[PDB]
Amino acid sequence: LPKPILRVQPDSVVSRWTKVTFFCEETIGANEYRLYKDGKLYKTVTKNNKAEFSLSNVDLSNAGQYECSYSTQYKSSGYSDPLKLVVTGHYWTPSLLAQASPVVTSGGYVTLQCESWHNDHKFILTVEGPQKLSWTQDSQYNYSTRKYHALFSVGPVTPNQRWICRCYSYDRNRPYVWSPPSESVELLVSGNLQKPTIKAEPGSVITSKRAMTIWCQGNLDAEVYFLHNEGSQKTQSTQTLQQPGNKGKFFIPSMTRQHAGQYRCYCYGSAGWSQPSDTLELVVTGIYEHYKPRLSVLPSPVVTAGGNMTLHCASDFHYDKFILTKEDKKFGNSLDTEHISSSRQYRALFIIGPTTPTHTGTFRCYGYFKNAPQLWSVPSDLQQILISGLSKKPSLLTHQGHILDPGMTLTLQCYSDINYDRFALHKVGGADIMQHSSQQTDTGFSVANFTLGYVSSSTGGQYRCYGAHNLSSEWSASSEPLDILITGQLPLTPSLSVKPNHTVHSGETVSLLCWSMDSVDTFILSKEGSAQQPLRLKSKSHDQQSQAEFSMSAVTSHLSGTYRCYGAQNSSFYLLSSASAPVELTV
Amino acid sequence: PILRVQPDSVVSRWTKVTFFCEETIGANEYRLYKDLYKTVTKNKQKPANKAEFSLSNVDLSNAGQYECSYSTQYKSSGYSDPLKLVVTGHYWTPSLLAQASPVVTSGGYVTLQCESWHNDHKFILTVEGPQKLSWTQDSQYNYSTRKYHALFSVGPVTPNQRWICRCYSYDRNRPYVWSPPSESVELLVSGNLQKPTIKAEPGSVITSKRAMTIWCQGNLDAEVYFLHNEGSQKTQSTQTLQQPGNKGKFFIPSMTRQHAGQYRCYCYGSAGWSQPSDTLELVVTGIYEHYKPRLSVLPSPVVTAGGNMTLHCASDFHYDKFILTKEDKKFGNSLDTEHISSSRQYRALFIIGPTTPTHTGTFRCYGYFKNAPQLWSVPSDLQQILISGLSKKPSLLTHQGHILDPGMTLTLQCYSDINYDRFALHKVGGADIMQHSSQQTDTGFSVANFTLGYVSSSTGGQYRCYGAHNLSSEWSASSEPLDILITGQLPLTPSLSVKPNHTVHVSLLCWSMDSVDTFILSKEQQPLRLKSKSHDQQSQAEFSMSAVTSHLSGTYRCYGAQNSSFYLLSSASAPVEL
């Protein structure tokens, strides 16, 4: 019979009072297995090819050499190579933990629990001060954690003394006398002096794994600043930058989940403790990366001053609440998410009161859950809001004509008699807003180049322009609407007709007509170099053909003539048909 | 003075006590202050110089803090060190007090002390819940206060259960026979759920003895909101307005010292406790009304956008710090007070970075001490700041003429081509700024009439004008300066002369024997300035024109002025008609 193999989990060197299991692996199938400890029968396991020997809570006596044997009814033969099980004792140093938090109001108590691995009857808590205060407690035994502990209630805490606690344990009459001390647990006292001002230089919202600093500047007689996280964390700083005034540095290399939450600066000085700082809430983003939210604005990203505006942030994921932020700073408050039964979206409408110039900026929305208020989602694609104002209306004129072809490039241009430092272009129905600086032309007024790429079907619409000053943050009023029309998209093609003679006199009249057998809702007259708004007429169909009369009264030589006519439908108000054969009239 | 008690400060019940107020000086009257309680008058006619305050048969109500004052008729000054008078009861009912504060972090302990005046050996602390938790402690005896007490450490506190503690006392040999309970002390748990938003409708800064409301709106699954003052106070509200959402009402009839400090809203609901609200700091003003501070601005109450500006608030009293407020809201932070050794003033300079339109408003400054950060002084006389902007320059014209004499009323008028909703007038060197509504004249531009009272010597100066829009908070640029000149202030009167002919188809001269620095020509129009060259001890000035037109025909007068006052003119000069 082949020799068996004995395994141990965990490793052969185990700490005291920890469960261990002996695994006896054998390829043959054995009716029973026998574990021999130091040459004596210790255990016997029957059935279940591998058998286990569980030794929960290993004591010092259980340490030694072990052997496993496997047996069949017909024969047993093999003894395994012995594996030495070694038990390691525990340290005598006790553990001192603020059972609630180091925060204490003046004249109050904070409960501290001191645990250790001693059979010692009594524990001691001492405070580092001119007078030495001691508390003596008996050791209680917790059967679940298998550890001896004792709770202390230090106090009453006076706001003039610095409280640093250390724990000791001993027995009354044993040679080893006292145990080594625990780690110093310092209490945070809510004094009566003036509160320090806590700030965050990068901001209160930081993406994960990035650096940030937390500084609180308080009284000039301070000595030590404490940065207490409400997630039960505490950082201590003594060396503070003296210039200018007392400023306590707290640096975090990379933000994680354990660094988010509310923070308060506690301050001890020459005149005692001080009132705690304001609750600065830190927020770590970059979690929940899969479902990025999306934000949009109604009715337009540019609204008049003092008007209704509703921002809409929704996500396919079941977020609990949505929070809006402007720039890197929090904005407004949190709103619950509403589950639309149809669109499968969790919605939240950020209704805003009468608009103010302060609302102008860059908005983002985040998603998070109630159980983790400081763990936000990935930021959403930014949505820029620009509230208009009551300044003088700039003018938006277009080189190269209104009605364009796909193969030409349009560069929009906005100017204003008032010296505006910056101009903004907006397309009605769009979301993005383009901002360009203004250059001082020789005529003395500002001019902004708004370059636009190759004209495509999307480019047609309505463009408005706004002005602003450098120091100012309030934008101007809207500029007169600008209709950009795109030709050559609709298959239908109209035909043009002229009523009278080609050579009309300086006072003659001409009613022209463009008609088409195919259905056309509106017709548009175009002039060569039509920098002017083309004339739009609805179409009245006497025959199966749609037609429209563009009457001309008291024509002049400047009006050389009218050349092409275009068709349009109600489905797309500003996407025009192809051109009609040109017709040149001469006055 | 020193206040003595016989017997000791801790007296048995129903026993007579006497207060001795010993003072080396002789005082006409004595006043005992409890927490004015009694007054004995001895106008030195009485032999003894010390007065007694007999409190026969002391009950529980007499316990508290006591102060004695001694006064001379001409002055009173001294308060004595308060001696805590403790009355000891014999009854069974115990008292339960949160030794620190009801605030608890989830999974922690809060120490509660239960004291009583009985010889009961054991105390019990019970929590009001479905599961019954009990703590049994032996009574420790304090020999100083002669009262039996026992400390309890309730916990661990779970953020899912509502913790309401009541204390009982009993005897060891018999159980189930408890004494009546103490007042229910409910712990405030710092949960992990979403934090409520705490607000104050009137504001965070309120004058004393006035009413205010504190509302915190949190989760819609809440049940009870707790408003905990960091001065160890707690208000509980259950009935909340359902529409719209859960809103907890907290009303205070009159604000006092005990209502100031930082407040936080703790919230318990169906899903457990929640993180406490933000630390809303309440401040009660109207205290220290004796020494009102004063605030001023340099260089001018109207500065250009993005410029240096320093606000100066000082007071004769030794305040620790000064705080600036805009409107009813706090602004900036606190600044230490600097004791100027010469002017006996405690100074604080509020330096402001590059100006922003948000700084436009109404500023006040308060004084307070470090030991009481929420007890501020009486508000100072307001100082209004109006930051200018980059809008189009308005125009400033004056009906009824520029140069006026006293006993006349001047109505200033400011217009601008841009539709401005509101106009503001400023006088260079002044502090106040006048704001008027705008009138839309038929010409298409806005116009504001700025009425000025009876013209006096002080009223002369330099007035500027600014424009604004309703929705906007950014003001316009400055309007061209307007110099107002006052006639009839200097006794000397100059004379004018014309050389050629009465009927011109010419350099004029205004002369004065007395020393005169500058001369001012006036048209019966922007006045003309002439410097004086002193030939033969007389001052004179020639005004050349190099050309003449029909419009220039008129009556021209000259006034005198000195460098000491640029806008205080002399009396009128005899007319000369061209």
Ligand SMILES: *[C@@H]1O[C@H](CO)[C@@H](O[C@@H]2O[C@H](CO)[C@@H](O)[C@H](O)[C@H]2NC(C)=O)[C@H](O)[C@H]1NC(C)=O
């Ligand atoms: C704004 O755009 C125009 C063109 O889009 C710039 O230049 C003018 O271009 C037209 C024809 O394209 C010429 O007839 C003009 O003579 C050009 N003007 C000048 C001054 O060269 C114009 O310069 C742009 N503005 C700025 C500040 O770059």
Ligand SMILES: *[C@@H]1O[C@H](CO)[C@@H](O)[C@H](O)[C@H]1NC(C)=O
């Ligand atoms: C066309 O115009 C010419 C002159 O321009 C005129 O003589 C002629 O009669 C006109 N004919 C018609 C048909 O209108």
